[PDB]
Design a protein around this ligand. Structure first.
Ligand code: ZN
Lengths: 218, 103, 142, 58, 159
RNA sequence: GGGCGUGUGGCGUAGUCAGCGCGCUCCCUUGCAUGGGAGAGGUCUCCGGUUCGAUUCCGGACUCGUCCGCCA
RNA sequence: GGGCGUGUGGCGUAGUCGAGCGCGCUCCCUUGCAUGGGAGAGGUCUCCGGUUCGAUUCCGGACUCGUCCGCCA
RNA sequence: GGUUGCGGCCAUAUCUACCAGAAAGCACCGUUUCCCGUCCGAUCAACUGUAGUUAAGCUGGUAAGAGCCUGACCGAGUAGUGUAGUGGGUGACCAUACGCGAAACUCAGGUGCUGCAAUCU
RNA sequence: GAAGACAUUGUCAGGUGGGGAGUUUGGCUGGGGCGGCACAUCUGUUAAACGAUAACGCAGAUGUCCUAAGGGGGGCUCAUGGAGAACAGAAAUCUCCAGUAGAACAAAAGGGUAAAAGCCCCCUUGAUUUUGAUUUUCAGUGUGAAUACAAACCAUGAAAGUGUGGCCUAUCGAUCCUUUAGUCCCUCGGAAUUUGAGGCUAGAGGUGCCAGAAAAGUUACCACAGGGAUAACUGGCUUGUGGCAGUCAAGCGUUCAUAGCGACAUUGCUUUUUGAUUCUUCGAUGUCGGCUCUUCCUAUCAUACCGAAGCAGAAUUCGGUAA
RNA sequence: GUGAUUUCUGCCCAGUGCUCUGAAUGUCAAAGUGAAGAAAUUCAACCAAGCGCGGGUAAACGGCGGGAGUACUC
RNA sequence: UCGAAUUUGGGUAUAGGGGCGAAAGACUAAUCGAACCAUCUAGUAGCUGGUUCCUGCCGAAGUUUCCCUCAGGAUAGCAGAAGCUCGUAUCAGUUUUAUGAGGUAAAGCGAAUGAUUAGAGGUUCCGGGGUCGAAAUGACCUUGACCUAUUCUCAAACUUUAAAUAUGUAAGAAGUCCUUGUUACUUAAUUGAACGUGGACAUUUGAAUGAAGAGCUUUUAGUGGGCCAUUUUUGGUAAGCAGAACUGGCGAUGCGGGAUGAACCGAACGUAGAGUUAAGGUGCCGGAAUACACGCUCAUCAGACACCACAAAAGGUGUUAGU
């Protein structure tokens, strides 16, 4: 009962989010976005691999769900359920419309054609760009060959072209590997639930000393 | 709406030329006289054979009328008219709105 | 104005219309196409509120019918004498112009006033003629 | 039988055939809309100025 | 149906601005306009009386009438294939003097000063403005400025 | 497929931005006939918004009953 | 052809994952214009798989039944 | 230079937490007969400048302070965009030519200036 | 003989009167009809940073309400949160602190507003008179709405000032006719007085199809002028839907992803389905089905030769060259 | 109007018509009557039929419903 | 069907909104849902068709507003003709300089509004589930809220910021400066406002470029169905679909090229000669190198040129070059 994704592949319309002018959309099919060992610390998983688009198109929420299930299932079967952290870095906010025509014989007796042809919501999609990350996984350096294969299996569920790039960053942060290493040898990083908070030279010295004590322990 | 029965307003009655006290009423049209020229012409045109000779209006659309206040100066008896906006309810009896009291 | 125009399709059930210069209340509405090409015609069955007679009219749907203003007002009885009710308004105004009802409503009201209940009377105004339709009893404020 | 609703095609070409000529400006523009208390005094001022110049170059 | 009211499509045009709402400062009331002044029109949304229409926002005109709290301004409006003359009565909160006119008057007085001082010698005053001429010959030296050779950089991911 | 109406205690329903009557269950009174008073009983179809407050004003959803879906 | 829902003892019918009542008649007691009362029998919860610890109950498939929409000049 | 009265621009002036304030001026402060206003001389009104106090207001200073302001060849000539091609590509879109050119970010600095009149160790 | 000043007859007046006559029976429109109003308007957006800008585009609104919810002045600060106080609790009243508006301003939406444009109090009628000018829509016509003045007469405040309705953007109506107010002025033409009538200036009674006819159907007995500006065939563009084919592989298959299948996803092809559109044809291209007859396509049911199997034989299934 | 014979033709007069020798001020023309006026004229009373009120009529046009309980009953 | 409700001759009666009808709207002289003849009548038509010699010059519109307006008119615009007043300017689909105005593209969300993923630390007179507890405004875990510091992703009807392109004004003689006349306006006041007298400043007189004359008036035709291309853009799965914005075109237009074609590329046209080219080409058709140079590809469906007349996902120790 669902149209093929080629009818909604391209970004032909303006963004159409769920708002107080829509008020009746179907809920998204993808619901879980962070999975694997999502409660892991930052220095547990140094390596990060990205599935990144090469197209300017719309990805369906159904396709996002299918790719998430495929990559998660493959990596938990080959490497264990808590050896990786996968994060879906796109969210379906664009709403797809359909002008539903009757498929009955002699429909033109009651069709009215293209008059008042404004559509009804039937699906949700995420609008991506050139070089935008869809999937991001962080793991140890011993799981590179299985997370590349997991992303390669997940790439079949997506239209268009995607690339698998091994990032130069440490995990889900934005510093490089030696930059993060020379930062964490000092005490100016401090862990959070999954992420890490950093020290800055601004701010009040009392707060900067109750937090982050080992760097000032010089 | 509500309009008070009296009003101090300008009177161009050639002796006042200022604001004097005025008693207000509502304007009534008065009966259409016979021997008005249009009525005589209409009766002459309607006599004989030919049926109805003038249009009769049917497609009524308004539900209200504009109210007209007839102001009457208490000194020199001169009269003025002024119209208001359209209102469904109108009254001249002054029952003033009061604020901090119950429903 | 006393009365205002409306469209036949704009009319619906339990609404007031003017039929043959009488205030009437609709009980039935039915629309049937005149010819396959043509517009539907509205057949209206209504009951006069004052007299209870059944009046029907059919018209084009696009035609405009006259509609009265009906006001229902709430009063307390003071006396029933000579077939004329005497009523008492909020803020203490009193009217005696209402004639007493002549049917089983009037008989029940007469017996209720004879045996001494405090009676709440609903009287309706439409197109310059006045009548009483129903009575209740005040459950509180005895 | 629907038809074309509105367009502005060819309109600037039609305008620029014979140009968008600027309006002709003049010395002594019109005094309409100017304040009447100003104009009522301006009349007497010019009348006195004309009388003084006539008496000077009489 | 369609809607073309007097203040249609004026939402961001008649918003005030960020963090300068409230009452207007007294310089706009202390500024003095004379007949023949050239003024810019920018409406103030805080003042609802004497407002200009949305067409005249950002338009520049000439004062022709001065009244108690307002100013009469003349604008040229393109209607069809010609310009028409439009007279507007605007309160003084919606206008300010055009700075280009006072810049040109400063050029006039400095130009007359130059002509007056150089008339005592006759030194070919050359009072017209000239645009940006092509830059002439020069000698650039390498003393402490030996050239540094640059090359295109190879490609990287940078994510 | 589209449009209209519909849900209130068991029933009839009425209504201002939940009332009675007849049902039910007790009690009391007096026939010829009775009548009265108490109670238990209603998320006003449902869910939101608006509003001091919504049966009432609006939107969305459900159920049921209707009326159209024609010319070739 | 497609869609939607349905399936309980001989019959009707109640089922929140932890098969009851009524009707038919088995027996006994009880008696005109033939009753009542008391103990009875009676299900593979349409069937087949999985989940659970155990599915009438949850899910998937099949069968069956009942509704709704559908050819041309 | 401090303070007061009236200001202009309206945070470089605001906010948070502390510290300091000679002189003068403001201020808190004392009083209810009169004018006046309140449930309440708390606010407002009036009287005294006396009985007192810098505790507060106010002013200034401090803070790897929040905010705000300025600058940078900091990001970045990046994103975007006007013009051009019988350019590439199935397409989606993308390079090049002649031009214009951001915002976030990062870093550095700053934290009221001033007009008129009066008055002050 | 009967009847008799009654019938009859004549002229007016009321009723009845499709038996008959004359006429009418909106427009837009992805054909028309039904539906809706995109027909007079308003807010935000589409709208592409001056202005303008369409669709039966999207989200909504108007035919009202208000003697205060208008005008002037004075005092005060709101939503909310925290901490307290008998009954008193989630919500009654009182007290303090924080509080850039997160409240309120009649309504739809968007702007605007903090010693206020909000809440409370005091006084009032400028929601008045006389005609001009200007802005929007625009032909620079009308109507509606609005802006700034002039000449009066007022309100309010100590005053500066402010006020010609509603904080701003919507909230509405020609000619003819009737009627009211003013001037108590002009005319009734042989001359006067008084009624009556007609004029001048300013309003009201209304046309919502809102620049403004007085208006029910049917026609399969039908007619005329036209139209491919416009529907019902084929053909053409498209392929949602229909049909057919792939890729990936969680699983089914005792065990085993792929012998045979194959979920969640996703890429296509075809024009033997039905839609969508209106390009051609309305001075006509004979629109069901069947019978008859020829040829073409392959996405192969059988026959020929083969490959694979959860192919022992028999039977069967999958696939290839093949029309 | 129905359409030989045979056998039957049930219920309903609310509506639309049709029809009364009923009862009689509600609607109520012209002429006529009265009042006011100087008259044109204005205002009232009175006011025929028909409407309106009250009956009849279906071999007149026509019409022939729902909710409960146990076909039946309410 | 054929002895009668039979068939039929002649005479006679009924005539057009009339006749006659065992009823079909049948028949009424090949005419009937109102006969025929003549006249009114050359009835009206916003509708279809046609509209008669040559050459020269200029040369459109399918757009604004109103209309029972939507196949039509009026009005404005576009066009022609007649000119008139002057003689290089009170010009300009252009740039520069100076100065405004805007809220789109972009960006932002550890900035307001709204949406939204994940943990962390806290708050329980201040939650809910379990377990331990006599119970406890008890305890221990867990899960929900609220707060604090973070984190991932977004907005046509969100925004602090904010382009590019378009867009207003100014760049003097109708100017600047000095002095002092008028007034019933205005000021406490010759204070100011406006218009003036007299005097000074001239070709670099106030940026560039170009001017082909500049300005003005009257009158009237046709038109008021448009369509296509690039870019921006709306509805739609899409369309040789429907609807907008700026420009250029076709219509109205031939010529060279795209084999062919309204719109594409090049270029716009008096009659000829010579030369050079544009776009496109140079094996032969076919005018012009079977030129030169470096590589790649062998297809048992090769490929061969924009608009344009199609092909994708997924694969291949085919072959080549790379990381
Ligand atoms: Zn007077």
């Amino acid at each position: 009962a669902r149209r093929p994704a080629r009818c909604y592949r391209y970004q032909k319309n303006k963004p159409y989010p769920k708002s107080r002018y829509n008020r009746a959309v179907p809920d998204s099919k993808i619901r879980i976005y962070d999975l694997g060992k999502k409660k892991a610390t930052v220095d547990e998983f140094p390596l990060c691999v990205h599935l990144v688009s090469n197209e300017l198109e719309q990805l369906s929420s159904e396709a996002l769900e299918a790719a998430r299930i495929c990559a998660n299932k493959y990596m938990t079967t080959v490497s264990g359920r808590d050896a990786f952290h996968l994060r879906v870095r796109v969210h379906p906010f664009h709403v797809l419309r359909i002008n539903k025509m009757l498929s009955c014989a002699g429909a033109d007796r009651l069709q009215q054609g293209m008059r008042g042809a404004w559509g009804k919501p039937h699906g949700l999609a995420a609008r991506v760009d050139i070089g935008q990350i869809i999937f991001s996984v962080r793991t140890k350096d011993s799981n590179k060959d299985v997370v590349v294969e997991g992303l390669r299996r997940a790439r079949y569920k997506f239209p268009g072209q995607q690339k698998i790039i091994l990032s130069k960053k440490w995990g889900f942060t934005n510093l490089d590997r030696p930059e993060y290493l020379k930062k964490r040898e000092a005490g100016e990083v401090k862990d959070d639930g999954a992420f890490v908070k950093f020290l800055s030279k601004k701010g009040s010295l009392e707060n900067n000393i109750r937090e982050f004590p080992e760097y000032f322990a010089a | 709406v509500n309009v008070p029965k009296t009003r101090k307003t300008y009177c161009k009655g050639k002796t006042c030329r200022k604001h004097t006290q005025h008693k207000v009423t509502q304007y009534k049209a008065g009966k259409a006289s016979l021997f008005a020229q249009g009525k005589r012409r209409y009766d002459r045109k309607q006599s004989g054979f030919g049926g109805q000779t003038k249009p009769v209006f049917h497609k009524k659309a308004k539900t209200t009328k504009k109210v007209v206040l007839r102001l009457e100066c208490v000194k020199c008896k001169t009269r003025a008219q002024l119209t208001l906006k359209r209102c469904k309810h109108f009254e001249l009896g002054g029952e003033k709105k009061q604020k901090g009291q119950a429903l | 104005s006393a009365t205002y125009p409306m469209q036949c399709s704009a009319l619906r059930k339990n609404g007031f219309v003017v039929i043959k210069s009488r205030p009437c209340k609709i009980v039935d509405m039915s629309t049937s196409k005149t010819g396959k090409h043509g517009h539907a015609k509205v057949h209206l069955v209504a009951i006069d509120i004052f007299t209870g007679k059944k009046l029907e009219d059919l018209s084009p749907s696009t035609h405009n019918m006259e509609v009265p203003v009906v006001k229902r007002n709430e009063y307390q009885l003071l006396d029933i004498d000579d077939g004329f009710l005497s009523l008492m308004n909020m803020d203490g105004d009193t009217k005696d112009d209402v004639k007493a009802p002549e049917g089983e409503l009037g008989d029940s009201l007469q017996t209720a006033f004879d045996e001494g209940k405090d009676l709440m009377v609903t009287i309706i105004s439409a197109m310059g003629e006045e009548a009483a339709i129903s009575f209740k009893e005040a459950a509180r404020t005895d | 039988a629907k038809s074309k609703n509105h367009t502005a095609h060819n309109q600037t070409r039609k305008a620029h055939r014979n140009g968008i000529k600027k309006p002709k400006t003049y010395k002594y523009p019109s005094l309409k809309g100017v304040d009447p208390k100003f104009r009522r005094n301006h009349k007497h001022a010019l009348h006195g100025t004309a009388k003084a110049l006539a008496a000077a170059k009489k | 149906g369609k809607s073309h009211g007097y203040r249609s499509r004026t939402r961001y045009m008649f918003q005030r601005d960020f963090r300068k709402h409230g009452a207007v400062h007294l310089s706009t009331y202390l500024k003095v306009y004379k007949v023949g002044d050239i003024v810019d029109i920018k409406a103030n949304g805080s003042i609802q009386k004497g407002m200009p229409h949305k067409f005249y926002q950002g338009k520049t005109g000439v004062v022709y009438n001065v009244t108690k709290s307002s100013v009469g301004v003349i604008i040229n409006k393109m209607v069809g294939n010609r310009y028409l003359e439009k007279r507007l009565n605007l309160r003084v909160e919606h206008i300010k003097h055009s700075k280009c006119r006072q810049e040109f008057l400063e050029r006039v007085k400095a130009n007359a000063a130059k002509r007056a001082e150089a008339k005592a010698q006759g030194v070919a005053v050359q009072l017209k403005r000239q645009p940006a001429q092509p830059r002439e010959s020069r000698i650039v030296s390498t003393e402490g400025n030996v050239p540094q050779t640059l090359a295109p950089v190879p490609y990287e991911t940078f994510i």
